[PDB]
A paper describes a structure:
As previously observed in other members of the enzyme superfamily, each ALDH1A3 subunit is composed of three structural domains: a catalytic domain, a cofactor-binding domain and an oligomerization domain.
Each monomer of the ALDH1A3-NAD+ complex at 1.89-Å resolution contains one NAD+ molecule positioned in each of the cofactor-binding pockets. As expected, the NAD+ molecule in both subunits is accommodated showing its extended conformation (suitable for hydride transfer) and interacting directly with residues Thr178, Trp180, Lys204, Glu207, Ser258, and Glu411 through hydrogen bonds, and to other 20 residues via hydrophobic interactions (left). The adenosine ribose is held in position by hydrogen bonds between the 2′ and 3′ hydroxyl oxygen atoms and Lys204. Only Glu411 makes two hydrogen bonds to the 2′ and 3′ hydroxyl oxygen atoms of the nicotinamide ribose. The extended conformation of NAD+ allows hydride transfer between the substrate and the C4 atom of the nicotinamide ring of the cofactor, a necessary step in the catalytic mechanism which would not be possible with the NAD+ molecule in contracted form. The highest B-factor and lower occupancy values in the NAD+ molecule are detected in the nicotinamide moiety in both subunits A and B, whereas the adenosine moiety displays the best ordered part of the whole molecule. The ALDH1A3-NAD+ complex contains a PEG molecule (PEG1) close to the Cys314 residue in the substrate-binding pocket, with 6 and 4 oxygen atoms in monomers A and B, respectively. None of the two PEG1 molecules were covalently bound to the Cys314 residues, as it can be deduced from the distances between the Cys314-Sγ and the PEG1 atoms and also from the electron density shown in Fig. 5b. Next to Cys314 there is a water molecule that, as it will be shown later, will play an important role in the position of the PEG1 molecule in the ALDH1A3-ATP complex.
Residue numbers in the entry:
A (entry chain B), B (entry chain A), C (entry chain B), D (entry chain A): 20 to 508
Write the structure that this text describes.
C-alpha cells in the first residue's frame, strides 16, 4: 500500500499561461480549505476576465498554423500524452494527497480510483492520436471526395469539485490527442491537482500555450470562458442548472460547440432471479461510494416484490458496517461531505421520507459533533411521488422501491428527465437484454456497478448531458469535419 | 424536358398530424404568395403552440416502445424511405411546380436540382437503416461491453424559404432511417411542398404520427418546437441570429440536442494558374444560382492580380447574358427575389457598393420597375472593409476582390466569423491541397462549385453551424449512444 | 400462398456472355434431371476452357478504365442492384419453381426461404454501393495520406447444388456493389436459376460483360476458372476437398484472392436451464431442414445430463410427425435427397451407430421403394469417438450426446477441425455469453437456429472457410486497398 | 550520431521456445557470415520439423482459454508492446549493429531507418490493443446481433533477408496486439536480430510461449510452419515463387489464413512538369536504397521525353557521387550485396543490358575485384522488352525509360503481373490524381518515395501479394470474425 502524505506542502498556486506561472491581473487570491479539518490549506491566485483573455490569446497563438504544436506529427502528440501519463504515475502519491486535501476523499481512493482513471484515460487517448481517421467517399468517376477530422481549436474545460483531476483529464486527453489547445477552469473548491498537473504538462514537453489553467469562481472565470468570442468549444461537468447557463452563453456568444456531463436520478433494478448478495453489495457501493457525492450514484433502488424484504434486510446489515473517519487512515471507506451546504442538504430530505409514508430502516442523522459526517441511511416502502425518490440527494441515503413487472419497472425507471446511468441485476439472459435496450440511460451496467473503462463512452441521455466522454466517441467532440471535393477536368 | 405546370391547383393546405389533415386550433390562416405574379396562391392553416402540442403528443405515441414504428425491422424502415422516394419521383413535376410557385426559382432548376437532391437524399439514407452499427469494445476477460446507437426520439425540424423541400428532406431522411419520429415546421413564406410531402408520407405507408407538419410563423410554431419539453432533438436551417435563439431555447428548456446549418460569407479563390474559363463559369453559377439566395453563394470572389482584369471582363459577359424572367419559361436562369423585404435589402447593398468606391461593371438596379427582378450585378475593385464584402447579400451581386499571395488570401478568407463553404481554382497540386487544409470551411470545393452529394457531409465551421447534414455523419445527429457493460460472474 | 408451377418450361439453357446467349464452343450439352421424378428436365450448353476464356475476356473488357460500368457513379450501381432485386421479386414464382425442379426442395421453401434471401441480400448490398469508404490517415504536417477501396477486377463465383441461386447471390450482390465484373459457374446438378438470373441481369440494365455465366462440370469449367491467369478473385461455396483444390490452383496460377464457404460439424448445446421445447424444435429444424443437406446442419446435439432423457423423448416425438413427399404439395416439409450418391451416403452411417454402442431411437431406413426419401432418424447414447458424431452425414440423422459441465462441452464442441456455426440453448445470461465467447464458430446462435440476416456476416473458422459473406465484412473480399501518399513541397 | 559497434559479440544463437533457449533437436548448426568482411560471425542452431512442433505446441498452450496471455485485459497487451518498444529503443545500437553485420547495410541506415520503423510499428499497434472493435448490428425488434473480432490463434511468420527485424516486427506488432501467439522463422541468411528480439520479449514480460523463434532453412523450418495443422495463420514476406509454395501448403494442410508480401516491378513516373531535382533525388534513393535490395525499389524509371536527357544527366551525377564502402563508416550510403549468388545475378543483368542495346551511363561492374560491392549503375535508352526492365534486379541498377503520353505510361506501368508500389512526380493536380487512381499498385507515392508510416497500409495488387501490413487494415489479418445472434423469447 502507498504511504499517506499527511503534511504535504502545496507548491503550485498560480495561473498557468504559456508554461509560466502568473499572479492574477487584479492581485486577488482565494483560499482553499481542507474538508476533513475545516482548516485553510493555502491561497491560490484568483483569475477573472483579464486572466481568461490572456489564457485564450496564448491558446490561439499555440493553435495557429505553423506553430510548433500544429507542426508536430500525429504520433508525436501521442508520445507527449504518454510522457504526461508517465509523470502522473511518477507523482501519483503527491497528486492523490492534494486531491484528499482538497476533497476530503480517502487517500487510498484518490490513489487507486481517481489517479488510476487519470493514467488509463491519458494512455488510451495517447493511442488515438495517429488513428483519428476521416473517410474517402465514392461519388462520380471524375471526383475525389474526402473528409478531414480537424482539431476544433481552443477548448475550454470547466470541472466540478467531486472528481477534480479525473473530470479534467477526461477532457484534456481527447482534446490534446486531437490537436486542440485548452483553457482549463477547475472548481473554486478544488484547484490544487489541476495546478500541479500544469507543472507536469510543462515538464512533459508540451509547447507553451497548448494547456492554460485559470483558477477562480464560476460566475467570473467560468462565465468569461463560456461567453468568450475566441473559445471554439467547451466541455463542462457539473450541475444541470449551471450546464444550462453555460450552453446558453455559448449559444449567445459565438455558437461554440458544447459537451455537457450532468447529474442523474440513476436507477438500480434488482430482479427476483438476481444473485441477491451481488445486488446488495453493488447497490450499496452505488449509493454510498464517495459519500454519495458521485454523478453515477444510485438514487432509486427498484426491487422485485419476491426479494424485496430480504434485499432491505441485507442492505441494512451492509450500511451499518461501513467505516467512516479520517481519509488518510487505511481503514476509512467514507470521509466527510465537501462542505456545510452539502451536509445540510443531505440532512434535509430524510425528514420528508418519514412524513410521506416511507419506513426508515437505519441511520437518519449526522455522525458526531466534530466533522461533516452523515450516517448511512436506508429507506423502505418508498413510492415514486415521494421527495426521496424524485430528488438527487447527493448523500448517503438509499431509497428502496418495490416493483412487480418488467414493463412496469421500465416505465418507472424512465419517468425522469435524466438518463446518466442504470444498473440491472438478473441471472436471466432475456430480462438483462430487454432492460438494457429499454432503459433510457447513457450507460447500463448488468450485474455490476461503477464499471468504467477509458475505451467505453460515458454520458447522458435527456437532461443528464449532451455528447460523450471516453471511448472513440469522445473524439467526435474535439474534431470538426471538413469535406474536400475535387473535380478532375 | 418536363412540361411546365403554369396553373396548378394546391390541394394540401392543412396541419398534418397522425396522417390526418387538421384545421388550426385558432381557425386562423395565413396567405402564401407567388413572387413572380405577386398574386396570392392560397391560404394555409396557421399553427400555434396548441397545434405543436398535439403534433408532439402524436410523435411521442408513435415513438413509444411496442408501437408499429418501433417494432419495424431495420430493413423495413429502409423500404419505407425508398417507397417515399418513388412517390417523390412519381410526383416530381407537381412538387417542382409547387416549389417554383412558392419561391420564384426556375421550374427546371426545381425539377433537376431541388427534386433530384430530395430523391437522392431519401435513397441514400434508406440504405443506411440496416447499416447503423454500434461497437463491441474489448475491456476485461470477464466483461462484455458494447454500444447501441439508439434513436433519439422526437425530432423537430425548422427550415428556411430558399430550398424548402430539400432542407426538410435533409433532416427527414436520416431522422427516419434512424427510427425517430418528427414534428416539421416549414418557413411561413414556403409551406406548400412540405404539406404535399405529408400526403406522400401517408401514401408511402408510414405509421400515423411518425411525421407531423405544423405550418406557421417562427416566434409562435418555431419557438414552441425549440422550447418543447418533449422534443428530444431539433435540426434548424436558417439565419445565424435565429439559430442562436433556437439553441438558447433548447438549452433553457430540456437540453434537446441541436443541429444548426446557418449562413456563410463564403470565399471563392481564383489563382493565376487556374483554368480561367472554368473558374469564371463556376464563380458565376456560385454567386447567381437560385437568384443569389443560397447559403453556398460566394460572398467574396478573390482573384489573383495576374488574371484579375480578364476574370472581371469574362464575368461581366456571363452576367449580361443570364436570362432573367418568368420561372416557368424554359430559358429562364433567374426568377424574382423571394419578397419585397429581400428585394429592398439587395438594392440597398448595391447602392452602398457605389457609395463606398466599388466599380459597378453591370446591373446595379431592378429589371423593369414593377416586378421583384434585379439585374445581375458585378462589382470590381471591392475591398474587405466594404459592406458588399462583409454582408451576406443573398441576391444576384458578384463582388470581385484582388489578391497577391496565398498566405494573404488565406488570412483574408478566414477573417470572418463564418465558415460554411470555400472554393479554390488552381491547376497546382500543392496549392490546392495547402488551401484545402488551411481554409476554415466545412466544405472546400476544388475546381468546381456547389458539388453536393447525399454521401458527403455538409455543414459549417465557427458561426456557420454545429453538426453535419448528409453522409454517414448525419446519423450521429439522430442517434444517442448507449454503453451496455455486463460483468460475468 | 403462391400457386405452384408444376409444368414450367425452361427458357434459358445457354452460356451467357456479353448479355447474349451462346452455344458451347464444342457444341456439347449436358442434362439436368428433376430429383423428385428422376426424369430429365432439359439440356444445357456445356462450357469448357474456351467458353471460360471468352467469358473472362468479356469481363476484362467490361472492367477496363473508361468502360460504361467503370464510369457509372456509385449510386447508379446501387440503383442497378435494386432494379435486379425488383425483377427477382416480379419473377419470384418462376425462380422458385426452377429451383424446386433442379433441387427437389419444396416450392414454398424455395419461394419463402431461398428467394427471400436473394431479394434481401440484393437490396442490402445495393445500399452499400455509395457507402464503401476508405480512410484519410494522419501522418505528418506536410503529407496527405489516404486509402481507396477499389474493385479487385474479374471475380469468379463457383457454387453448389443445395442453395443454388442463394449462394450465387451472396457473391454477386457484394461483387457488383463494389464495381467488379464476374464469371459465374453454377453446379452442374443445378444450372437453371443462374441462367434465368442472367436474363434478369440483362433486363435490369447491367452493361454487357459485367456478369457472365458458364454452366459445366467442376474439373472442366471450375478448374479453368480457378487456374485462369486473368481472373483476379474467386469465391467458392461447396465441399472442403474441392475448396482446397480451388485455393491451391488459385495460388499456383496468379495468386488470385479466394473466399471459401465450406462444410461444418456444427454443434447444438442444450443446457439444463434451456426452454426445452424451444431447444427441441430448433435442434429438430437444425438437423432435418432441407433434408439435412445444409451447411448449417447440426451434426452433434450436446444435451446436459439433467434434461438428456426428456430431450431425447421429445425429439423422437417431433421426428415422427415430419411430412415428407411431393415438393410442390403445400403440406410437404421434406422432399427427396438430390441424388443416389447422397441417398446411399446417408443410409451408410446409421449401421455404424448401432454397431458402436449408440441406441437407435427412431427411423433408421429409407421411406419407400419409389423415390430418394429417408426416414427421420434419432440416435441416443452417442460418444465423441463414434462415426455418427465425427462425420458430416448431410442427411436426416440426429445424434444426441450427453455432457455434464460447460468447460467439458466447450472442449468437446471445439475438438473438430471445422467451425461454421454453433447454437446454444439456455435462459442464463452468463452461460450464454461464456459459451458464445468460447465456441470456435463463425456464427453462434443463442435460443434460435438458422437466423441469417443480409447485414450479419457468415462464414467459417478453421477448415469451414476463409473470409466472410453477408454484412459489411463481405465488402473486404471484393475490394483491394490502395494507399495514396502525397508529400507537399 | 551513434558510435559504430565494429566488434560486437553475438550472445543469442539458440532456438527460443517458452522463453527459454534450446539447442536444435538434431544438434546441427548453420553459419551466418558478414557480407562486408566475408568472415563467419557465428553458428546458429539449425531447426527442423521437430523444433517447429515443439514451438507450435508452446504457442498453442500459451493461447488456450484461461492462460495468463488470454486472461490479460486489452490495455495490458498494449502495455507489453510499449515495454518491448522501450527495450528495442534502449538496445537500438546493438540491434542496428547486428543488422549491419548480417546484411551489409550501413549502420546509420539500420539505426535511423530499420530500427526507427520497428519502434514506430510496435508503438502504433500497442495503441490498437484496446481499440479492436466489432459491431452491434440492427436486425429485428426481438434480436440482439453483434460481431466479435477474436484472435485467430497460432500465427506463423516467415521473413526475408533484406529487412530482417523490420519485416518480423510488421507481423509481430499486430499479431500480439490482437491476442495471438506466434512461431517466427527469420531468413537463414539473417537470424541474429530476431534472436536478440527474443531476449527482449522475455525481458518485456510476455508470458512463455507467446513468441517462439525457430531459425533454419526454408524447405525444412519454413515448410513445416506453412504445412502445420495447428498453425491458424501465416504471414510471409519474400519471393513470389516461395509465396506460391507457402499458400499452396496452407491450402493443402488446414486452410490456415495467409498474408503474402512479395516482390514488385515498381514504376517511377517522372512527368515534364515535375520538380526535376526532387524527382532525380527521389528516384535515385528509390533505386539505390539498401544496395537496391528493397521490394519498393523502382524497377522502371519512366521519364517524359521533354525532361529525359536532363533527368539522365543529373541521375548519373548522383550515382557517381554515392559513397560505397564499409557499412560501419559514417559516410557509407551503400554497403556490399548480401551474398555471391545475388552479386553474380546483378552482374549478369548488367551484362544483359549492354548486349540488348541499353546505353551504359555509369558503373556496370564490381567495385574492387575481391569484395561483394557493385558500382552504382545507370542505364539509359531502356525499352520494355529488355531484361533489365522486366526482371527484379535487386541491385544498384537504374534503368531509365522514355515516355510520351499519360495514357501510354499508364498502360506500360500496369502491363506487369506485379503491383506493390508506384511513384509519380508532377506539379499538376489532375495528372497526379488521375495517375494515383489508374496505377494498379498497393501504394502510390506522389512527389516522394519510400514514404512509409506505421498507420498507412502497405501491400500488393496482383502477384505482389494478398492482404495488408501496417495501418488499421493489418488487424483484419490477425482476427477472425464471429457473429453472435440472440433471439429474445
Ligand atoms: N460525469 C458527470 O456527469 C459528472 C461528474 C462529476 C460531477 N457531476 C455533477 O456535478 C454536480 C455538483 O458539482 P458542483 O457543485 O461543482 O457543480 P457546479 O455546477 O455548481 O459547478 C461546476 C463548475 O462550474 C463552474 N461554474 C459555476 N457557475 C458557473 C457559471 N455561471 N458559468 C460558468 N461556470 C460556472 C464552477 O466554478 C465549477 O468549476 C452534481 O450534480 C453531479 O452530478 C457530474
Ligand atoms: N455456406 C456454406 O458454407 C455452404 C453452403 C452450401 C453448401 N456448402 C457445402 O457444399 C457441400 C456439398 O456441395 P456440392 O456437392 O455441390 O460440392 P462440390 O464441392 O463437389 O462442388 C461445388 C462446386 O464446385 C465445383 N467443382 C467441383 N470440382 C471442382 C474442381 N476440381 N475445381 C473447381 N470447381 C470444382 C462444382 O461443379 C460445383 O459448382 C457440403 O459439404 C456443404 O457443407 C457450404
Amino acid at each position: 500500500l502507498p504511504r499517506p502524505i499527511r503534511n504535504l506542502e502545496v507548491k503550485f498556486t498560480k495561473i498557468f499561461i504559456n508554461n509560466e506561472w502568473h499572479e492574477s491581473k487584479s492581485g486577488k487570491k482565494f483560499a482553499t480549505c481542507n474538508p476533513s479539518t475545516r482548516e485553510q490549506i493555502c491561497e491560490v491566485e484568483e483569475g477573472d476576465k483579464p486572466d481568461v483573455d490572456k489564457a485564450v490569446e496564448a491558446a490561439q497563438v499555440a493553435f495557429q498554423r505553423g506553430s510548433p504544436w500544429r507542426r508536430l506529427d500525429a504520433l508525436s502528440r501521442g508520445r507527449l500524452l504518454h510522457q504526461l501519463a508517465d509523470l502522473v504515475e511518477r507523482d501519483r502519491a503527491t497528486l492523490a494527497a492534494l486531491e484528499t486535501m482538497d476533497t476530503g476523499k480517502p487517500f487510498l481512493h484518490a490513489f487507486f480510483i481517481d489517479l488510476e482513471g487519470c493514467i488509463r484515460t491519458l494512455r488510451y487517448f495517447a493511442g488515438w492520436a495517429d488513428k483519428i481517421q476521416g473517410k474517402t467517399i465514392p461519388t462520380d468517376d471524375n471526383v475525389v471526395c474526402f473528409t478531414r477530422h480537424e482539431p476544433i481549436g481552443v477548448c475550454g474545460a470547466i470541472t466540478p469539485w467531486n472528481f477534480p483531476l479525473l473530470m479534467l483529464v477526461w477532457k484534456l486527453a481527447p482534446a490534446l490527442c486531437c490537436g486542440n489547445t485548452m483553457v482549463l477552469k477547475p472548481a473554486e473548491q478544488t484547484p490544487l491537482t489541476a495546478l500541479y498537473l500544469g507543472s507536469l504538462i510543462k515538464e512533459a514537453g508540451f509547447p507553451p500555450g497548448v494547456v492554460n489553467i485559470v483558477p477562480g469562481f464560476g460566475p467570473t472565470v467560468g462565465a468569461a470562458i463560456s461567453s468568450h468570442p475566441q473559445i471554439n468549444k467547451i466541455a463542462f461537468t457539473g450541475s444541470t442548472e449551471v450546464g444550462k447557463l453555460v450552453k446558453e452563453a455559448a449559444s449567445r456568444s459565438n455558437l461554440k460547440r458544447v459537451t455537457l456531463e450532468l447529474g442523474g436520478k440513476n436507477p438500480c433494478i434488482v430482479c427476483a432471479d438476481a444473485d441477491l448478495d451481488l445486488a446488495v453489495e453493488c447497490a450499496h457501493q452505488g449509493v454510498f461510494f464517495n459519500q454519495g457525492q458521485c454523478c453515477t450514484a444510485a438514487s432509486r433502488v427498484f426491487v422485485e416484490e419476491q426479494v424485496y424484504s430480504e434485499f432491505v434486510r441485507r442492505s441494512v446489515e451492509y450500511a451499518k458496517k461501513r467505516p467512516v473517519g479520517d481519509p488518510f487512515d487505511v481503514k476509512t471507506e467514507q470521509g466527510p461531505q465537501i462542505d456545510q451546504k452539502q451536509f445540510d442538504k443531505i440532512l434535509e430530505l430524510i425528514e420528508s421520507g418519514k412524513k410521506e409514508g416511507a419506513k426508515l430502516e437505519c441511520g437518519g442523522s449526522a455522525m458526531e459533533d466534530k466533522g461533516l459526517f452523515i450516517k448511512p441511511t436506508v429507506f423502505s416502502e418508498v413510492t415514486d411521488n415521494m421527495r426521496i425518490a424524485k430528488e438527487e440527494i447527493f448523500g448517503p441515503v438509499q431509497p428502496i422501491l418495490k416493483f412487480k413487472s418488467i414493463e412496469e419497472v421500465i416505465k418507472r425507471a424512465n419517468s425522469t428527465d435524466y438518463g446518466l446511468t442504470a444498473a440491472v441485476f438478473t441471472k436471466n439472459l432475456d430480462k438483462a437484454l430487454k432492460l438494457a435496450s429499454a432503459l433510457e440511460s447513457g450507460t447500463v451496467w448488468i450485474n455490476c456497478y461503477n464499471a468504467l473503462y477509458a475505451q467505453a463512452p460515458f454520458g447522458g441521455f435527456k437532461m443528464s448531458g449532451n455528447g460523450r466522454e471516453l471511448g472513440e466517441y469522445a473524439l467526435a467532440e474535439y474534431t470538426e469535419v471538413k469535406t474536400v471535393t475535387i473535380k478532375l477536368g
